[PDB]
Nucleic acid binder design. Structure first.
Lengths: 270, 47, 194, 130, 170, 98, 184
RNA sequence: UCUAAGCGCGCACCCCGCCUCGCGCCCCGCCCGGCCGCGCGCCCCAGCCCCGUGCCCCGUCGCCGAGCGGCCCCCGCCCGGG
RNA sequence: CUUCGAUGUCGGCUCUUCCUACCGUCCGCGCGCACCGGCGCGGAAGCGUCGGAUUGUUCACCCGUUCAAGGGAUCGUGAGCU
RNA sequence: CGGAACGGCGUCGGCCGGUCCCGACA
């Protein structure tokens, strides 16, 4: 037979599998289009959500009832402790797909970034970039490696670390992100721009301008094992029903003999 | 507009042959209709 | 046995290749985007997109897996002619390497082209021959341009090496005369004829 | 479709059938499928062969229209076409092929050892001029 | 396929104390088929069954193959529609060879087996008398055409285990 | 071992003589390199062949009997029947008499 | 059997070179290379006659000799005389107005049926677009290739497509009037 | 003559993108050590520019080195909060 | 023809997929298409096909509204319910 | 390409008719 009355599916199957994010933090994944003709610009920056607020605004939207009128909107402040670049990663465009062509680390890596490397800093032996510091320091090795990137790399990225001392949280260990460098006329200019930013602070003001629109990526708030009614949006069944009303009633037909992945099932929400 | 242009447009718009099946814009002296596999039925119309 | 896949019909070479695999020969196929599939492109794409419809309704992860890359398209075609389920079949699908473009790994390997499966001999002029590389891009492969960008550089590199090889071989000819003279006089024309 | 036409008098190397490796001359064309071929100086008796068996050779011999086996034999002798083909690269290989065909398992054993020594000598020479 | 001429007569009776000898030119695979066809034809055309008749001879005819001669076969094929008629024209060295070429085209073009076709007549046509374009095209004194199937020479790729260092040219 | 220098001709154990229903393990289908027709097999018929036991390291000897098909393939029998793990494994046809 | 021969004659001024199945025709108006590799044809430049011959002609291989010769003749005419397609805009109540731009390689059409939307069309490479200095309400397009001047004509013809209504009654658009083929 | 070659436009469909996951792999760090194998022209088929060969020995004596290319080897908890 | 040492039986609710023999939306094309609106085709299954009064209803019917196609899944869906 | 009446200026092959160098208003 047929559903009789037409009703849409509940939930986006695109957002399946609905599992707790195994990746530690929200990852950039894809980065903005390079363009190949703009002042060289970094494309991203990590932030810690601080809070939300009200902002009174004046609207200049021509053709809208709000034109020449005031409005109040929800704002979301994202705390932005200034990040520091610690390395430069170049990526060749290979037939298989973007694949790295070696990274050049900073001669001096800060303790917050080193804290990320270990599970317990106090009980660890601090053996990170120990022979690297000796291989560099003179810095001749760093330039030679950067030169290898200039010929073998087509997409340049800057590794950067947040300092969590200047943020109210207790993270103490830094968060590392590969921020892409885009817009320069050529790859040799891009790595030259990167060397100037190396081991020096980057601030949100430089990365993003007021009036631009940005895409915010993060792990959502976790609700734990949720019921189908909260997790997928289904109806709470009639209150005269035995064995519960907080459950999808029928999870499939006789055939297919197996429960389909489409059907809403109870799991982790958040 | 000018009558020469009206006739020029007619050549591009109402001077045609349409098969009864393909409903296609077949050529004027078309023995068969290409799209309809060659049914010989044909006609056209004007305002 | 590295066979340049260029110009071969997918099925015709796959039959020849499956036999050499099930007979304990290790075989690698390169430039598999340049392999041909007889049939107008419209039909080929249709038969490949009809393929990508057949997926398990209950969970599409246990469903028939369709791989967009043109190398994997061949690997699935050879797998059809190989009893992959048996150890004789699994160990033989292991001895097959499929590469889209000749890769750094198979750059210096000697390459042999199987004439029986080559398209110009196999199919009549006027059969709208398609290539897998064109078909692969439509069904989803995302790296057609990247293979083209890399093999342009590889081919340019081969041309520089070719001038050197010609000078190296002209030099080998002036070193023809040796006990090789005796060996050729004994075999190449005398009695054996080889 | 440019060079090597199936004109009458084309000398044809036979590539399949009862005669493979024997030259013959196209006395007459039957259809676009077959040809009548006679090779008096090679032992192919005037027979109807298929143009799939025949492989055309560059050399073409003038023959009388409707020649007859004896007349064909006389004309072949006067023409140098058999000889030109024999000293040509294809002819040299056909002559070599006859000896390669004349083989026994023991004869093959000697060639295999020689084809290992030629291979080793080639490696030595390539190294020596590296 | 083999060109047999058969001579047969009605069994001698008190009404026919000398029955009439009938000759036919049956092109057949073997003498056994040739004498079967002869009886089938006699039954319809002369009302003589084998059970009431005796074949007196079935002699094999051998024809020389010195030169290609055009040959014309008038036949009455039978397709699922019903019996029709058809004239064919084949350039071949010998009549039996031409008839073999005739039976193979009727198999491919008209899907009729040996027993479906009945041969009304076979003959030798002259270069002047050709009625069909295919025989006419080669009938002319000068005929040069590029090799029709140069690609067929891959019959060697079968044995070369298909591993040529370079891909062969035609 | 017994085989120290005999040049040998390459060969492959393609599988046992079989049908889709039954398998005669006694007969082993060998393909002799360079032998492409039933006609060429007569030169290689009755020769001694041997396969090297991969696990044991000691050769299993055999002889070549009648030819399997029109494609230069040959049927052979060995002193001990073949294991089946030796499929695709190379077989050596000795150029020398023993 | 049959070589399905068709023969065309090379003009004296223009030079034609055939290598493989590629055809380069060079002349005062310009040089065009039309690859005819799509089909099976044997071509001889000869003393002064291009011949396209298809040996063993099948049902559809019968068409190829004439077209390849006709296409080669259009190349010849283009590099000696040059081709022109005059298409006139016809406008009823609202006047269409097309402005030539991009150094005569582009047309910008506005006020088609008083539509806010404007249409920008780019001439294909080697063929240019111009307006008529005397008749007016007429676009004269001229280039060496006969296909590439017609292809631009068509691109401009369908860009002006009345959305629905009744096309027999509503006759506003750019319609090719004369393929003049004289000059550029 | 829209098609038989050739050619342009083109659907809320289709396929990819973005997005959700992701086996595995890559780079770097600490290290930076072992194991293996020896083998490169390109295009074109209605010019096919000289064709129709070659390899035919992975032990059967090849195992040097170098060069390319592979392959392996790494990398803690408990405990306390959230 | 299968099932009776038993496969719980109608309609709803709930939820999920599928089909096209397409109602609107999309693309062309024909009208006995001036406009508006209708009508007939070919491609098209992404999206929508709802709120209610009587009836166990499926249906039926009527009222409204962004005006509202038809069907498959053991006549989809009882250790899911009623 | 299970399939029917029914179509095809698809490509082959027939079977019977008329015009065709007297060249299918000049």
């Amino acid at each position: 037979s047929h559903r009789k009355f037409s009703c849409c599916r509940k939930g986006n199957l695109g957002y399946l599998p609905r599992k707790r994010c195994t990746r530690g933090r929200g990852r950039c994944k894809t980065f903005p289009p390079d363009v190949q003709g703009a002042p060289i610009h970094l494309t991203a920056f990590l932030g810690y959500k601080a809070g939300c607020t009200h902002v009174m605004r004046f609207i200049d939207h021509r053709g809208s009832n709000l034109h020449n009128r005031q409005a109040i909107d929800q704002a979301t402040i994202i705390d932005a402790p200034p990040m520091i670049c610690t390395a430069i990663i170049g990526y060749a465009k290979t037939p298989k797909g973007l694949r790295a062509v070696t990274t050049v680390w900073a001669a001096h890596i800060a303790e917050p970034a080193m804290r990320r490397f270990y599970r317990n800093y106090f009980h660890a032996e601090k053996t990170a970039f120990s022979t690297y510091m000796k291989k560099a320091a003179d810095g001749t090795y760093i330039k030679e490696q950067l030169g290898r990137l200039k010929q073998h790399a087509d997409v340049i990225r800057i590794v950067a670390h947040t300092q969590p001392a200047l943020t109210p949280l207790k993270q103490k260990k830094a968060d590392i992100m590969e921020i892409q460098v885009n817009g320069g006329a050529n790859v040799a200019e891009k790595v030259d721009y990167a060397y100037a930013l190396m081991e020096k602070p980057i601030s949100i003001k430089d990365v993003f301008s007021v009036g631009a629109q940005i895409d915010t990526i993060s792990i959502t708030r976790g609700r734990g094992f949720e019921g189908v009614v909260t997790r997928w949006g289904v109806t709470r069944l009639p209150r005269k029903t035995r064995r519960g009303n907080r459950k999808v009633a029928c999870i499939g037909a006789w055939h297919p003999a197996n429960v389909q992945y489409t059907v809403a099932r109870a799991g982790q929400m958040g | 507009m000018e009558p020469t242009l009206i006739n020029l447009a007619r050549e591009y718009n109402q001077n045609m042959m349409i098969c009864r099946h393909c409903y296609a814009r077949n050529p004027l002296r078309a023995t068969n209709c290409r799209r309809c596999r060659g049914t010989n039925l044909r006609k056209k119309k004007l305002s | 046995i590295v066979i340049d896949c260029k110009g071969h019909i997918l099925g015709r070479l796959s039959a020849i290749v499956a036999k050499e695999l099930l007979h304990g020969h290790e075989v690698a196929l390169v430039r598999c985007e340049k392999a041909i599939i007889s049939g107008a492109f419209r039909d080929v794409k249709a038969h490949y997109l009809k393929k990508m419809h057949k997926r398990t309704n209950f969970n599409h992860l246990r469903g028939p897996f369709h791989f967009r890359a043109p190398a994997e398209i061949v690997r699935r075609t050879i797998r059809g002619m190989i009893p992959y389920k048996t150890v004789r079949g699994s160990d033989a699908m292991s001895r097959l390497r499929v590469y889209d473009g000749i890769p750094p790994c198979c750059a210096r390997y000697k390459r042999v082209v199987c004439p029986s499966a080559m398209a110009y001999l196999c199919l009549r002029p006027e059969r709208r021959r398609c290539e897998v590389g064109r078909v692969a891009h439509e069904i989803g492969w995302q790296h057609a341009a990247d293979v083209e960008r890399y093999e342009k550089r590889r081919l340019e590199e081969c041309d520089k090496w070719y001038q050197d090889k010609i000078q190296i071989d002209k030099k080998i000819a002036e070193a023809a005369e040796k006990d090789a003279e005796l060996q050729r006089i004994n075999a190449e024309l005398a009695k054996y004829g080889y | 479709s440019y060079h090597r036409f199936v004109e009458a008098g084309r000398l044809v190397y036979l590539g399949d059938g009862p005669d493979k490796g024997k030259l013959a001359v196209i006395v007459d064309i039957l259809s676009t499928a077959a040809v009548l071929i006679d090779g008096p100086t090679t032992g192919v008796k005037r027979q109807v062969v298929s143009l799939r068996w025949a492989m055309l050779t560059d050399q073409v011999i003038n023959i009388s229209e409707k020649p007859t086996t004896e007349q064909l034999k006389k004309e072949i002798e006067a023409s140098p076409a058999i000889d030109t083909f024999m000293n040509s690269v294809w002819g040299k290989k056909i002559q070599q092929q006859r000896l390669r065909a004349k083989a026994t398992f023991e004869d093959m054993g000697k060639i295999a050892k020689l084809r290992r020594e030629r291979k080793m000598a080639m490696k030595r020479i390539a190294m020596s001029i590296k | 396929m083999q060109k047999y001429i058969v001579y047969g007569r009605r069994l001698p009776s008190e009404k026919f104390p000398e029955p009439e000898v009938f000759r036919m030119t049956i092109y057949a695979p073997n003498e056994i088929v040739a004498k079967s066809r002869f009886w089938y034809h006699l039954k319809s055309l002369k009302k003589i069954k084998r059970t009431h008749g005796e074949i007196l001879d079935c002699q094999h005819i051998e024809e020389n193959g010195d030169f290609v001669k055009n040959f014309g076969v008038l036949l009455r094929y039978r397709s699922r529609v019903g019996q029709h008629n058809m004239y064919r024209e084949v350039r071949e060295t010998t009549s039996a060879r031409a008839m073999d070429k005739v039976y193979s085209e009727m198999a491919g073009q008209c899907r009729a087996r040996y027993h479906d076709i009945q041969i009304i007549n076979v003959k030798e046509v002259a270069d002047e008398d050709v009625r069909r374009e295919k025989v006419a095209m080669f009938t002319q004194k000068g005929v040069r055409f590029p090799h029709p199937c140069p690609y067929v020479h891959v019959k060697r790729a079968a044995r070369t285990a298909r591993f040529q260092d370079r891909a062969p040219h035609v | 071992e017994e085989i120290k220098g005999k040049t040998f001709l390459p060969a492959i154990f393609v599988g046992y003589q079989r049908s889709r229903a039954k398998q005669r393990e006694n007969v082993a289908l060998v393909k002799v390199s360079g032998i492409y027709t039933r006609a060429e097999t007569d030169k290689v018929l009755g020769r001694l062949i041997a396969i090297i036991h991969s696990k044991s390291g000691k050769p299993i000897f055999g002889k070549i009997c009648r030819p399997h098909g029109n494609s230069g393939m040959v049927r052979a029998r060995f002193y001990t029947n073949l294991p089946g793990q030796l499929m695709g494994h190379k077989v050596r046809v000795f150029y020398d008499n023993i | 059997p049959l070589c399905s021969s068709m023969t065309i004659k090379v003009p004296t001024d223009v030079e034609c070179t055939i290598n493989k199945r590629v055809v380069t025709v060079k002349g005062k108006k310009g040089t065009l290379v039309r690859d005819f590799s799509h089909a099976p044809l044997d071509i001889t430049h000869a003393n002064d006659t291009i011949s396209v011959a298809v040996w063993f002609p099948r049902g559809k291989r019968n068409a190829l000799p004439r077209t390849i010769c006709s296409h080669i003749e259009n190349m010849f005419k283009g590099v000696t005389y040059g081709f022109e397609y005059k298409m006139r805009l016809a406008y009823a109540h609202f006047p269409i107005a097309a402005t030539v731009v991009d150094n005569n390689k582009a047309i910008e059409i506005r006020n088609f049926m008083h539509q806010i939307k404007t249409r920008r069309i780019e001439c294909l490479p080697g063929v240019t677009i111009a307006m008529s200095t005397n008749v007016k309400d007429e676009l004269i397009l001229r280039g060496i290739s006969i296909e590439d001047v017609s292809h631009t004509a068509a691109r401009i013809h369908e860009s002006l497509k009345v959305p629905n209504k009744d096309l027999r009654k509503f006759l506003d658009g750019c319609y090719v009037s004369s393929r003049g083929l004289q000059e550029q």
